[PDB]
């Protein structure tokens, strides 16, 4: 009756970003990160892998409403080192780990 | 045609739960989004049903 | 055992069945009754006879007479009601009866279950209502003080009157006349004390001493041997002095019969047959008696104002009956027939020298079962309205209840009295309003019926029993007296025997179980009831019969053996029906067994001569599905009573058939994980109020705050609580003697106009829509015209939508056109609707998340709901966790689950069998945040709990309006969502403003967002008279004669009225723009 | 009864008729030794928590 | 019933349940009811751009 | 009402198991083990049809 | 082929229109359901 059309959680409407980054003031080098259709699925899992990497200074998340699927993130890391790619990296060794894994998970299925 | 004691909709939602085979389920893309209008072959599948 | 009385009861409802009283008190009506009704005060200055009850027909005009059945009427809006013929004598149609559903004039009370089935009717179907235009009518008991018997009540210090004795009379059979006695006696306990009576039609009030000697009796000492049975009580006879010099005055039966203003005093015999305690007899030569009786009483009362018996208890339950339906059609009959025989006096009266429209017999009863106006109809709504109401069908457990249901016309009354044990349910009642004065009737409870008199008073005056007629009380010192209805029938000497043998002559059934029978001891006296209208209850019988120690009566071969119905249950002395007066004198024993070293867990357990069948026997429907109401709050049991009744789940199996408007049915059913012994008379397994949730009572987001539960959207999806909702708009095509008929099309143009907003494109040539049809905003659902070509068409209600499900067309007994359309749409729960388990802990969704967001259990299982454990504490309703556990059992274990009340079984016995099974002995699982998948630092009481879904979803409640339809008289909005309304911001809601000091913003509600309107008053004669001719700007306003001084305000609509009102009663409110009266 | 289906792509999210999961067990450190959660208990512990 | 208190249009009804993530003065609305109750607000050159998006 | 395809809580089908059940009653006289041997662990997914009252039966009795 | 309205009893494809009676091809039952559409009816399984 007033519930939106399901779909709404992960398409993006005509022309929005998926992606939305800010600068803070407040302290130097920094950013609030708002993402658009997404959750605790991939955001919690960005979070985790940022206090492995012992660059990051900071790194927390949070849903504004949960009516809404969608989140900010607000990173802060060392002098000179720009985030995005900590993220990068850290995302890419989320896939190595996972290729990693699949191959891992291959190699051990195979011996059924 | 639907004599059944069940309404339309009711036997709509079952149906819906029904598991189908999904193996090359991949390469398959969306009707919306399939630019043929509403639906066909190469996006959807139908089956029929009459008892 | 315990498990054996179960059979017994078992083997009661298998031959009586939950509405027993009902049909018993129809047939009562129709078998006899009816007769002896007819045949008393008929004869008219020509005689009537035995007079015959044809079967239903339905005389409709393009056919003969259809003999009509039950499951049609409902369809087609009918009445299932029979002809009534009568032999006159100086073959004839009189009225029309209803018949009761189920009972014996109806078809169904012979054919069996194949041959039911056949007939449409639902077996489950217990019947017991009727079925007036349409829609299923139930007549609901009333509640009244008995009549006929002694009380006695103190009168407030302030008022010339210490205490006064009353006492209701009617003939128990005979018109029944509603005049009762009134024996006061002024001057309080104290002040320098008259003894005063009040008679029908006597303009002040007489002194008792003239009365005995208007009898028969003029001198003493005769007196006192009526009075007092005990010259040696001096104290009772010291007050009496004052009160004989009173009378002394008048020394014979002429002057007494005289001073009540030779006419009169023949007129005074008069007032003594017809007047004075009318009920006993009207005969003629029994006037000693009733000089015992008024003695007797005049005695009852100083026992009482000498402080050596306390004042008659008013809620005395036992001293009150209950008019069901067969009686009720007496005292209104007569009202009728009492003016259909000065009817046919008027054709009589007309004749100067066939004709009797039975239809006034028909259209009288209807008129109250549809409305609830007993009393005749005319200019006469001096009735009582309640009676006969809109059966609920809601769910099944909430149309029982109904039927069962007992009013009580109007702060002490509404107090749960003792005497309210056994024989009605102490938690089932209304909340707010009028709550306690409607009661539901426990399940063992039964009402009266009527037995006979003298087969017992035969049985006594051949027994022992020296008549009344001739007394000595000095002679005669402990003669045991008997009281009869009311009645003093003669006294008894030793009765220990002739008692305890009419009793045993009862048990094996030939003077009718039915009939009461007290001895007060106390006092020696023998108290029989026979009665209509006196609650009564079952217990065992124990008799000594053991010479060989000191045991019950009932074996273990009566069990087992249950020709052997439960009439024979009663015909072997195995069972007594004990009404509340007779309990008064008895002693019963709860446990049967116990009644005739432990362990530190388990509940503290505190000449016998009867036993309970069983405690869990005393609830009504609402009680009896609580699993453990003795484990809550009580208060708050009495909520679910009253909740259960607004829950969804499948009321009847035929609805698919049923042209009702509203009705629900929750997509999946559940019977409970946890049950009462007692739902195996319920059919509850058949006829489930809702389903099991997978509970878990935790705190998570905040959404599950305040009453408020999370309910996990994914299992919403997988059909979790969905439901169809009907409705039934119906129509028809009215006519006039004036051949002028109106249409059911497809209407457009043609001179009117007269036609509705919505699309009529959805409407195939007949008028009429399909069922495939995706029906929304407006759109009319049927078609209709009046030509006079206005439309007459019924559009969906602009809030609603949905799907048709069935549409038909049928003929009237008009020869009119009838049409029903049937539109159905599934709801779906949505964050609004409101929900509850059996343990008044009623909540609506805050939130609905899905599996994965959910909190889980390692095992992998999940909750499909959250409830706050904020919701415990102050509740206190405990059973609910217990609930929860129990069926936390039984899920894994795979028995079902027995909840029933007073067993054995603890919370100390349930662990350790679920810790035989593998989970936690408490329930209590690991769980972990389906957010990061970290643990809870916590654990969580995680567990199957039953969960109805109650009515009441959002998308019926949500209203907003901006300038919609106004009202015609006021011209401010509508009421109601429905008619698209508007919010009423009464006195309260002006208040809290003013506190604001919002001045304006108030005075631009009650203006512009409602009335308001330019009225022109005159600045001489500050009326509102001005001709404000807007073009020619010609305004006037004769009388005053000026056109010169006017004003224009601004006031709403609403208080111009008032003001003409206030002219039309000749006040002058005068407006003035400026000040005159000066200071 | 006479039907027709049409079936199509879709998730979860989309709707619960999808899922191919339908309930999956998580546990670990089963012998609380990060101590990230504080057992209930009304005497000992280890024995009024099943193992 | 009618003059001390009266039944007003621009008003609005439903079934309340709370939010742990809105600001203590705020009130979350159904959309439904949004799209009916307005308000009179004049046009003035400063948010008429803002206003000639709502009117298309 | 008919038996409802996966169960609410957990997700895990149940439509198939119904004749099974149905069966192991009659003769087999079982509830628990039945249900064991059914594959139904965990009380979630268990519930659904000890719990499923079967009204179509008296529905299908009916005329159209 | 072609149908109407049906009968609660005798379930006999009627069909007719204005003062041509308001009962059946035999059962004087005036009951008569209004037949489902032609063009099929799309429903959602929610
Ligand atoms: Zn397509
Ligand atoms: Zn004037
Ligand atoms: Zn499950
Ligand atoms: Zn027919």
Redesign the interface.
Known sequence: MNAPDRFELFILPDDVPKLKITPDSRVPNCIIIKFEREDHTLANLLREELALYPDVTFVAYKVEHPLFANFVMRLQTEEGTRPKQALERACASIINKLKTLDHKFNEEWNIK | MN?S??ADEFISH?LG???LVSEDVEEMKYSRDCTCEDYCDECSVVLELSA | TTEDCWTVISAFFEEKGLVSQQLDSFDEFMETSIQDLVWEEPRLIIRFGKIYLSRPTMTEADGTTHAMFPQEARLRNLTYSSPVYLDMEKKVHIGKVPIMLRSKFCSLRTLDEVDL?KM?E???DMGGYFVINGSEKVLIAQERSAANIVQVFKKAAPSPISHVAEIRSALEKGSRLISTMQIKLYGREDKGRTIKATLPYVKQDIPIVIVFRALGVVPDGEILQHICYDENDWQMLEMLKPCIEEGFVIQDKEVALDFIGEKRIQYAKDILQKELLPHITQEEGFETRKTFFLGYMVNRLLLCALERKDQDDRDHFGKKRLDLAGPLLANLFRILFRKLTREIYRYMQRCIELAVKSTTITSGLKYSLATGNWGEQKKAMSSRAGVSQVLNRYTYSSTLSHLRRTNTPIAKPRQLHNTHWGLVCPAETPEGQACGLVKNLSLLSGISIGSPSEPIINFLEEWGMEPLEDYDPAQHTKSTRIFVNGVWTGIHRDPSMLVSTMRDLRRSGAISPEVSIIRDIREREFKIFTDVGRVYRPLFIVEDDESKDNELRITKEHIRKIVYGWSSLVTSGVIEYVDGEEEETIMIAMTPEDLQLNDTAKRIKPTFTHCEIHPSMILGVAASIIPFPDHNQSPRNTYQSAMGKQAMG?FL??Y??RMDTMANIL???????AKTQAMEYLKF??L?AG??A?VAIACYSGYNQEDSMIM?Q??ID???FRSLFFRSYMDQEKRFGISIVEEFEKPTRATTLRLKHGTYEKLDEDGLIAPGVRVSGDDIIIGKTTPIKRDASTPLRSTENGIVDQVLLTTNQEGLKFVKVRMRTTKVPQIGDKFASRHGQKGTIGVTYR?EDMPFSA??????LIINPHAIPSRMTVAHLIECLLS?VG?????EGDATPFTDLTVDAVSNLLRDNGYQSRGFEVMYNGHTGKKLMAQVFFG?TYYQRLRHMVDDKIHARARGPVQVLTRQPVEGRSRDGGLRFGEMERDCMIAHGAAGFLKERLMEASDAFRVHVCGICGLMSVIANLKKNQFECRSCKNKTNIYQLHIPYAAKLLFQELMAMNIAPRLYTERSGVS | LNIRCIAKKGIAKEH?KW?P???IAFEYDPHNKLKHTDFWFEVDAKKEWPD | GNLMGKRVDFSARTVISGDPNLELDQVGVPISIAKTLSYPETVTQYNIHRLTEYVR | ??I??????????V?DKWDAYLRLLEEGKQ?????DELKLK??????MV????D??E??????? | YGVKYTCGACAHNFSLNKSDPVRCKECGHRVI?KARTKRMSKFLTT
């Open positions: 004599t004691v069940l079952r739960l029904i598991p | 089935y449409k639902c077996p489950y499948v199996t035929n698919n058939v997509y999946y059913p559940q019977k409970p994980l397994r058949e489930p389903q099991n997978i996990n994914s299992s997988r059909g979790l599996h095992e992998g299982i999940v909750p499909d936390k899920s894994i274990r795979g028995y199957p | 619960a899922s999961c339908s309930a | 009402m008919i409802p395809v996966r169960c609410f809580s957990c997700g895990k089908v439509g509830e628990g083990d039945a249900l965990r009380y979630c997914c268990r519930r000890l719990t499923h009252v009204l179509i008296k529905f299908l009795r009916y005329n159209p | 359901y």
